[PDB]
Amino acid sequence: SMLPRLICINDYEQHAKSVLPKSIYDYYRSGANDEETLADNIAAFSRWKLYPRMLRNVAETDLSTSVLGQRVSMPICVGATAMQRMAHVDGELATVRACQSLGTGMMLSSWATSSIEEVAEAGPEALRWLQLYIYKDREVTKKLVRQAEKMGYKAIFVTVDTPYLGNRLDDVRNRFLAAYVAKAIDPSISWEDIKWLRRLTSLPIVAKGILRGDDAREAVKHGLNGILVSNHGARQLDGVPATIDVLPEIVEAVEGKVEVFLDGGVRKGTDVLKALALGAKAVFVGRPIVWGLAFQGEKGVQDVLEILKEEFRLAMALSGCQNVKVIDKTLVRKN
Amino acid sequence: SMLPRLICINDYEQHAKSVLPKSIYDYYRSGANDEETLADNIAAFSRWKLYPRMLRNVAETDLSTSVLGQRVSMPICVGATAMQRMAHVDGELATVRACQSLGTGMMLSSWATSSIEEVAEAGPEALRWLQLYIYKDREVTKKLVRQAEKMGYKAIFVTVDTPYLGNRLDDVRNRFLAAYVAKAIDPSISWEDIKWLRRLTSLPIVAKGILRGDDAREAVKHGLNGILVSNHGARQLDGVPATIDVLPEIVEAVEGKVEVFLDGGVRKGTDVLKALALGAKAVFVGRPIVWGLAFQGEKGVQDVLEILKEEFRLAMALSGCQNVKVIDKTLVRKN
Amino acid sequence: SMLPRLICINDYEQHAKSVLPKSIYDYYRSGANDEETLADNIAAFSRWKLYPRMLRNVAETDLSTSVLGQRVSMPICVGATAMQRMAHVDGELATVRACQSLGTGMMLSSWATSSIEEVAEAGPEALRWLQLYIYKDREVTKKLVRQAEKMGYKAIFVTVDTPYLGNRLDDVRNRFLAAYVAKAIDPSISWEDIKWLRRLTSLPIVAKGILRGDDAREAVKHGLNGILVSNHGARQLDGVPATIDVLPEIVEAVEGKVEVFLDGGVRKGTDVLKALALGAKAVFVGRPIVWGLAFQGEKGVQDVLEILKEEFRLAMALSGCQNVKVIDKTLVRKN
Amino acid sequence: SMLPRLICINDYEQHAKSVLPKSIYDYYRSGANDEETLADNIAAFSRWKLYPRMLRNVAETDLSTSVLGQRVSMPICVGATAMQRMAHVDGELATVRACQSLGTGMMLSSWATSSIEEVAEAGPEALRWLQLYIYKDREVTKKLVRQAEKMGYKAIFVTVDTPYLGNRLDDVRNRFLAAYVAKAIDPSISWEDIKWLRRLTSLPIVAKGILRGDDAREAVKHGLNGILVSNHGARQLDGVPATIDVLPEIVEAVEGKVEVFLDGGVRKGTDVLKALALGAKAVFVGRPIVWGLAFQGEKGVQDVLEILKEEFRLAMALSGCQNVKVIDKTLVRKN
Ligand SMILES: Cc1cc2nc3c(=O)[nH]c(=O)nc-3n(C[C@H](O)[C@H](O)[C@H](O)COP(=O)(O)O)c2cc1C
Ligand SMILES: Cc1cc2nc3c(=O)[nH]c(=O)nc-3n(C[C@H](O)[C@H](O)[C@H](O)COP(=O)(O)O)c2cc1C
Ligand SMILES: Cc1cc2nc3c(=O)[nH]c(=O)nc-3n(C[C@H](O)[C@H](O)[C@H](O)COP(=O)(O)O)c2cc1C
Ligand SMILES: Cc1cc2nc3c(=O)[nH]c(=O)nc-3n(C[C@H](O)[C@H](O)[C@H](O)COP(=O)(O)O)c2cc1C
Ligand SMILES: CCCCCCCCCCCCSc1[nH]nnc1C(=O)O
Ligand SMILES: CCCCCCCCCCCCSc1[nH]nnc1C(=O)O
Ligand SMILES: CCCCCCCCCCCCSc1[nH]nnc1C(=O)O
Ligand SMILES: CCCCCCCCCCCCSc1[nH]nnc1C(=O)O
């Protein structure tokens, strides 16, 4: 295969560090402040131990599932990551092409270096969603939703954990965004604006960035269709729990009323299994996709997605699960 | 800005290590004995995880609060640190000037390299308090209180955790204070002397150095106006808990009868948020102020205070808090 | 003695790393994926603390016990490890000869580089068992059992945790087995095939690879004679618990109906004591045997087994135990 | 003072490593096997946190206490360490002279490089006890007790955790004792031999090496006068708990019927405070005494003892304790 030989997600990061300008690599890697939550997003997955069932017959595995009523090849989807064209010339076009190939969904950043329309045209058969920021300018906010609707996108992920940008130390050091966001994004965002957004579109809406059970229930009350349990990849408020650690309480709080997803520190097939065992319908990957792009554009993303798929297929088979329906809560226990 | 580029409190320490004579840097940095509590003052903050509320509207933040009935710009104040003129020529004059600029309070060491009067004259509009040791000589002890009263200081912080000085290994190695304190400070100090001090002055009095809930309640009983939960920056008895870990029990013990403050290991805006979520009215910083002074005197202190302010403003906004009144206990949970 | 001087199991590994080609050493050492469980198999033993009884009279120790009704010199036996002829020319013949000398049992891999018959002929007086994989080809599966029966083997250990091979990163890097196993081993294996196997042979059957209490009880229900609590030396599903940590729950689940064994991270006499105190009849060693072989073939295996025996004899005597019958559960408590 | 400048117990060890032949340093330093308990004897003290009382009046401290009815200057005494003449020419004579100077007790090894009589003559006013092994030869065992009685020793510490010597890896590597002990010490030792010993002498008898509450109570039943909670400095059975962690359960089990002491990992004044807060009458130091000897014979031991005394005096004063009677259990809580 392609050289150098990369066989797990960490290899992709290690490769990306070797080829990317420091300030770009740093921008992608960084967490907020002392990066306590960034270390924890990963370490937390390790604390959840797996309890595999044997002798279940795993000759045939079917990794397919559904996200907000749309079928996907696997419970592993591409999360929004700004400015993908810094990692590769093809940026978000490469990403959507790979998602089309794999049969999974792509969440498009509002801060994409490719337009809603262009992404639809590169991947017309891909499952596509828009990640939306509520800008101070509600007119452009509305325009984005309408372009998403018109261009055949299938949900809006409204990010609710970024009234201001987090403080990522390397970005400041590298004189690299916090000021631009403060100029553009509306920090006044409340549940009122979520009601506005719910009236504006009939598309499925997911609140991205929920970490509390009470906010989750509030999301349900406002007719939202899903919760993405996210600490924004540990890039916003540092010292928040790992997403894997809060997921079960969010899942409990929501009472099956709404689909619950996770992102933050997914690197391996076992991370995927553990999230699903805890009640997540699907997970999203942020950084691994950028590492994929940095390695080989479309094929790199495809590689990263296929590593995650097959790692997940194996962990599923080793744990006695033929498909996602048979993943249950007795599969996991925290140490 | 000023070079080298320092953007968080740790940078200031790293700079101070590079420019200060070893024995001075060491004197400032050191904890007691094996520095177990010194590591814990910091590590403990990391264990307390934040549970941010989303969609609260944080377009306007007001960090102002009040300490012992006096208004301050932020719940972040300067704690007493002896011999500031070793870090910078302007020492405590630079410090009070910065506190005046920021609108926060300065706690003046009894072991200041500037007099009560001089500090009042450098920062006549600054909120100023005296940190008092009860010397064997009660006449000078009384003189200090009377000078503080006459010079427009607004409280006495009586330090109660230093009957003798702790054993800081580097100070001994560097042949650098323990003997001088044993000659000067009265180890016979009991609750009787606190009753004396309470009769001596009508100024607000805070017991600094309380780590036990029973002592806290005893402080309330003696008509004291506040508790500063402090292990003296881990420089007295090593192996005492981190201040953040004992705060909630002190807060509980006191039953809202008296204001409770914290110092010890505050380095970040999130440390400030976490202390307030646990019931502290305000925090004090010791070392970061000395690092500030070592970098650029007044402006350095101002920089350190402004880093803490804005870090705190951000952590507040990211956690859904517009002001300090809405900080509550559901914001935190220990891991 | 023989040089270099090796006096504990870790020395043997350190020696084997120095003399074996990297890809062979790596093949032997590796765990699955990030090797979380591989670190835990060992670290977990360290968390279980010993509570030795004094003054019991340990002048005479008898380490003998019985496995599936057959007497052994010690509760320490050789687990199946594929392709031993990579470590030494004599491979499995050297291993069985050493087991014969020591009076303990050898578990023979289905993937041995020596035949069932040859191993019987090298060690005709050795206690010998067959580790069986259920191949897609049930005819060869049956042939192996029949050769084991005919050649005087005394049990079948059916491995139930390998429907597919785990992903061992170094093997992939070194272009070293996963594909060959997927071609050969039947992933469709269920409890039905265990019923088949139970009808096929009157030999004692042990399910190897059980990690769950419910599977353990299911094993009992199917007339199996033992459980080998195993995570396949952390080489299958990564993130499963250490075997020492799940043993007590398996032991409880089984209600003394069946003998329970452990493998995974046994390196020391105290590991052996701790497993027995938790309810294991006997332990199996995988890697230490390969390290032994790499050092000096038969004598190396003999050395490793004798280190384990005597380490175990000492830990037994120091803990007040004259024989295995007096090992009890009050001997251990987890920290 | 004397050079190099050593100001805490760790400095003494660091000095001893620099001047002692490796095999001698190693012999002294080593724990058993992987030295898990050796690390834990120390780390465990760190987990017990101190809760100092303020404002108690600590102008006068009295560190004096009593051990088995005999007064000592401090609750810090010298434990038995074999072959002290390897660290210094004066060996046990230097040690007893220092104990005489300080007014504390010396526990003399049965494996001393100085005789019972000679030690009595070097330190005729020192508080002296004999550490006794029950040799296979009961005639010499009895002779030692009778010489101790005749020479004015005031207790027998019978070591009950060494039926065989532990396996200390460096000793084996360095070809350095296990065989000699197996030839000399009786592994058949039971409670019967303790009854024998109790009939043999009217001297106070302490069982040294108890780690279990049931053995402790058995010790009480046999008319023993004290328990020394000891894991033999982590040199016997590895993986036993730290002595500080089991002390409170031993203390509880004994119901104040008998005095309870601790050794194992005492390096600091706070270690002493923490042991007493948990119920120990006194602690014993092993290794620090050998480090003292290696530095400067008698004066070195004196220095180490005085460091421990004054460290303890300070920790006592900082925690609000004027004497040992006022040390209580609310002073400590495990983290
Ligand atoms: C380089 C980068 C850029 C990101 N840009 C966005 C964005 O534009 N919009 C958004 O909602 N989240 C953004 N996020 C957060 C991700 O959507 C997601 O929550 C996070 O990457 C998932 O964690 P993981 O990277 O550890 O997979 C970004 C994250 C990274 C790492
Ligand atoms: C260099 C230094 C000097 C100090 N001098 C005093 C003092 O004179 N009086 C006093 O009450 N506390 C003194 N303290 C303790 C501080 O008031 C405070 O409790 C501690 O610095 C806060 O912890 P932090 O440094 O980790 O912020 C000193 C602390 C340091 C680090
Ligand atoms: C190099 C190696 C080869 C192995 N081959 C087999 C095998 O052929 N069949 C099997 O059931 N288990 C196999 N195992 C797993 C072992 O039977 C056993 O569960 C594991 O080695 C015990 O753990 P330890 O190595 O840490 O002792 C193998 C393990 C290793 C390390
Ligand atoms: C070098 C050395 C020699 C020892 N020799 C004896 C001995 O002869 N008899 C005995 O009962 N204990 C012996 N011990 C154990 C000590 O009495 C004691 O339990 C241990 O040293 C205390 O732990 P610490 O060294 O960490 O202080 C020895 C310990 C060491 C470190
Ligand atoms: C091709 C024209 C450029 C399109 C506009 C892109 C501007 C993006 C600058 C603002 C920085 C966003 S960084 C961000 N937003 N949300 N999450 C993140 C993150 O870095 O985690
Ligand atoms: C300008 C004339 C000098 C004024 C007197 C200063 C003497 C200070 C020497 C005593 C050392 C105090 S160090 C201290 N006190 N309290 N806390 C500390 C600390 O180092 O934490
Ligand atoms: C002498 C002729 C060769 C006999 C057939 C040996 C083929 C073995 C190749 C398959 C790789 C097995 S590796 C394995 N199986 N079970 N556990 C393991 C392991 O590596 O843990
Ligand atoms: C001057 C003549 C020599 C007197 C006899 C000394 C012999 C000692 C050799 C046996 C080794 C004892 S080491 C030991 N015993 N108990 N605890 C220990 C230890 O090393 O912890």
PDB file of N, CA and C and ligand atoms in Angstrom, chain A residues 27 80-83 85 109-114 131 133 159 162 165 168 171 177-178 180-181 185 208 232 235-236, ligand 5:
ATOM      1  N   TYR A  27      -2.799  24.009  15.340  1.00  0.00           N
ATOM      2  CA  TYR A  27      -4.187  24.445  15.273  1.00  0.00           C
ATOM      3  C   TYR A  27      -5.135  23.244  15.358  1.00  0.00           C
ATOM      4  N   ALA A  80     -17.874  18.061  11.966  1.00  0.00           N
ATOM      5  CA  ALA A  80     -17.412  19.346  11.435  1.00  0.00           C
ATOM      6  C   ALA A  80     -16.026  19.750  11.916  1.00  0.00           C
ATOM      7  N   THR A  81     -15.112  19.988  10.986  1.00  0.00           N
ATOM      8  CA  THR A  81     -13.826  20.572  11.340  1.00  0.00           C
ATOM      9  C   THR A  81     -13.547  21.698  10.364  1.00  0.00           C
ATOM     10  N   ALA A  82     -13.479  22.921  10.887  1.00  0.00           N
ATOM     11  CA  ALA A  82     -13.177  24.126  10.121  1.00  0.00           C
ATOM     12  C   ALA A  82     -11.920  23.987   9.261  1.00  0.00           C
ATOM     13  N   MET A  83     -11.942  24.683   8.129  1.00  0.00           N
ATOM     14  CA  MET A  83     -10.754  24.983   7.362  1.00  0.00           C
ATOM     15  C   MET A  83      -9.967  23.733   6.985  1.00  0.00           C
ATOM     16  N   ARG A  85      -9.207  22.814   4.029  1.00  0.00           N
ATOM     17  CA  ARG A  85      -8.271  23.078   2.923  1.00  0.00           C
ATOM     18  C   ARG A  85      -6.839  23.423   3.374  1.00  0.00           C
ATOM     19  N   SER A 109     -18.808  21.928   8.378  1.00  0.00           N
ATOM     20  CA  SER A 109     -18.579  23.148   9.163  1.00  0.00           C
ATOM     21  C   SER A 109     -19.225  24.354   8.479  1.00  0.00           C
ATOM     22  N   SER A 110     -19.850  25.227   9.265  1.00  0.00           N
ATOM     23  CA  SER A 110     -20.177  26.593   8.807  1.00  0.00           C
ATOM     24  C   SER A 110     -18.929  27.383   8.381  1.00  0.00           C
ATOM     25  N   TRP A 111     -17.783  27.045   8.973  1.00  0.00           N
ATOM     26  CA  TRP A 111     -16.487  27.631   8.616  1.00  0.00           C
ATOM     27  C   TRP A 111     -15.731  26.759   7.608  1.00  0.00           C
ATOM     28  N   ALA A 112     -16.460  26.191   6.654  1.00  0.00           N
ATOM     29  CA  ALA A 112     -15.836  25.398   5.597  1.00  0.00           C
ATOM     30  C   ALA A 112     -15.137  26.315   4.595  1.00  0.00           C
ATOM     31  N   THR A 113     -14.038  25.815   4.037  1.00  0.00           N
ATOM     32  CA  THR A 113     -13.301  26.418   2.922  1.00  0.00           C
ATOM     33  C   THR A 113     -13.852  25.955   1.565  1.00  0.00           C
ATOM     34  N   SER A 114     -15.060  25.390   1.597  1.00  0.00           N
ATOM     35  CA  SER A 114     -15.848  25.009   0.426  1.00  0.00           C
ATOM     36  C   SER A 114     -17.312  25.345   0.743  1.00  0.00           C
ATOM     37  N   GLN A 131     -23.348  21.793   9.887  1.00  0.00           N
ATOM     38  CA  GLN A 131     -23.070  22.281  11.221  1.00  0.00           C
ATOM     39  C   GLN A 131     -23.243  23.787  11.163  1.00  0.00           C
ATOM     40  N   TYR A 133     -23.437  27.547  13.016  1.00  0.00           N
ATOM     41  CA  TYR A 133     -23.301  28.532  14.070  1.00  0.00           C
ATOM     42  C   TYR A 133     -24.377  29.594  13.927  1.00  0.00           C
ATOM     43  N   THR A 159     -24.319  24.136  16.873  1.00  0.00           N
ATOM     44  CA  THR A 159     -23.280  24.116  17.898  1.00  0.00           C
ATOM     45  C   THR A 159     -23.599  25.157  18.979  1.00  0.00           C
ATOM     46  N   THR A 162     -20.084  27.194  21.864  1.00  0.00           N
ATOM     47  CA  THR A 162     -19.113  28.169  21.376  1.00  0.00           C
ATOM     48  C   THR A 162     -19.662  29.618  21.305  1.00  0.00           C
ATOM     49  N   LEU A 165     -14.821  31.602  21.335  1.00  0.00           N
ATOM     50  CA  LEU A 165     -13.837  30.531  21.126  1.00  0.00           C
ATOM     51  C   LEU A 165     -13.012  30.293  22.374  1.00  0.00           C
ATOM     52  N   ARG A 168      -6.788  28.359  23.000  1.00  0.00           N
ATOM     53  CA  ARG A 168      -5.857  27.297  22.626  1.00  0.00           C
ATOM     54  C   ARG A 168      -4.502  27.979  22.546  1.00  0.00           C
ATOM     55  N   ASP A 171      -2.141  28.347  19.361  1.00  0.00           N
ATOM     56  CA  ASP A 171      -2.687  29.301  18.385  1.00  0.00           C
ATOM     57  C   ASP A 171      -2.231  30.731  18.735  1.00  0.00           C
ATOM     58  N   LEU A 177      -7.914  33.692  15.621  1.00  0.00           N
ATOM     59  CA  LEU A 177      -9.218  33.064  15.400  1.00  0.00           C
ATOM     60  C   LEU A 177     -10.235  33.415  16.476  1.00  0.00           C
ATOM     61  N   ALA A 178      -9.776  33.525  17.723  1.00  0.00           N
ATOM     62  CA  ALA A 178     -10.640  33.939  18.828  1.00  0.00           C
ATOM     63  C   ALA A 178     -11.306  35.299  18.579  1.00  0.00           C
ATOM     64  N   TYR A 180     -11.769  36.802  15.568  1.00  0.00           N
ATOM     65  CA  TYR A 180     -12.662  36.666  14.410  1.00  0.00           C
ATOM     66  C   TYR A 180     -14.006  36.048  14.774  1.00  0.00           C
ATOM     67  N   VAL A 181     -13.976  35.023  15.626  1.00  0.00           N
ATOM     68  CA  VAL A 181     -15.197  34.399  16.132  1.00  0.00           C
ATOM     69  C   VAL A 181     -16.003  35.350  16.997  1.00  0.00           C
ATOM     70  N   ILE A 185     -19.636  35.315  15.750  1.00  0.00           N
ATOM     71  CA  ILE A 185     -20.576  34.410  16.437  1.00  0.00           C
ATOM     72  C   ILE A 185     -21.312  35.137  17.559  1.00  0.00           C
ATOM     73  N   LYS A 208     -25.457  20.284  19.313  1.00  0.00           N
ATOM     74  CA  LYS A 208     -24.079  19.834  19.471  1.00  0.00           C
ATOM     75  C   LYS A 208     -23.363  20.626  20.576  1.00  0.00           C
ATOM     76  N   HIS A 232     -16.491  19.718  22.225  1.00  0.00           N
ATOM     77  CA  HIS A 232     -15.913  20.416  21.083  1.00  0.00           C
ATOM     78  C   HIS A 232     -14.471  19.931  20.905  1.00  0.00           C
ATOM     79  N   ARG A 235     -11.657  21.721  23.082  1.00  0.00           N
ATOM     80  CA  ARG A 235     -11.110  22.975  22.545  1.00  0.00           C
ATOM     81  C   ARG A 235     -11.842  24.208  23.063  1.00  0.00           C
ATOM     82  N   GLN A 236     -12.932  23.993  23.811  1.00  0.00           N
ATOM     83  CA  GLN A 236     -13.683  25.095  24.376  1.00  0.00           C
ATOM     84  C   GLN A 236     -13.342  25.303  25.853  1.00  0.00           C
TER      85      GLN A 236
HETATM   86  C1  LIG E   5     -12.709  30.070   1.880  1.00  0.00           C
HETATM   87  C2  LIG E   5     -13.162  31.326   2.638  1.00  0.00           C
HETATM   88  C3  LIG E   5     -13.022  31.157   4.160  1.00  0.00           C
HETATM   89  C4  LIG E   5     -14.363  30.791   4.829  1.00  0.00           C
HETATM   90  C5  LIG E   5     -14.482  31.345   6.262  1.00  0.00           C
HETATM   91  C6  LIG E   5     -13.608  30.590   7.277  1.00  0.00           C
HETATM   92  C7  LIG E   5     -13.316  31.486   8.489  1.00  0.00           C
HETATM   93  C8  LIG E   5     -12.972  30.675   9.756  1.00  0.00           C
HETATM   94  C9  LIG E   5     -12.265  31.554  10.805  1.00  0.00           C
HETATM   95  C10 LIG E   5     -12.887  31.391  12.196  1.00  0.00           C
HETATM   96  C11 LIG E   5     -12.172  30.305  13.007  1.00  0.00           C
HETATM   97  C12 LIG E   5     -13.079  29.101  13.267  1.00  0.00           C
HETATM   98  S1  LIG E   5     -12.247  27.850  14.307  1.00  0.00           S
HETATM   99  C13 LIG E   5     -13.635  26.948  14.985  1.00  0.00           C
HETATM  100  N1  LIG E   5     -14.940  27.236  14.864  1.00  0.00           N
HETATM  101  N2  LIG E   5     -15.556  26.347  15.483  1.00  0.00           N
HETATM  102  N3  LIG E   5     -14.829  25.490  16.033  1.00  0.00           N
HETATM  103  C14 LIG E   5     -13.577  25.804  15.753  1.00  0.00           C
HETATM  104  C15 LIG E   5     -12.373  25.067  16.238  1.00  0.00           C
HETATM  105  O1  LIG E   5     -11.229  25.472  15.906  1.00  0.00           O
HETATM  106  O2  LIG E   5     -12.600  24.116  17.013  1.00  0.00           O
END
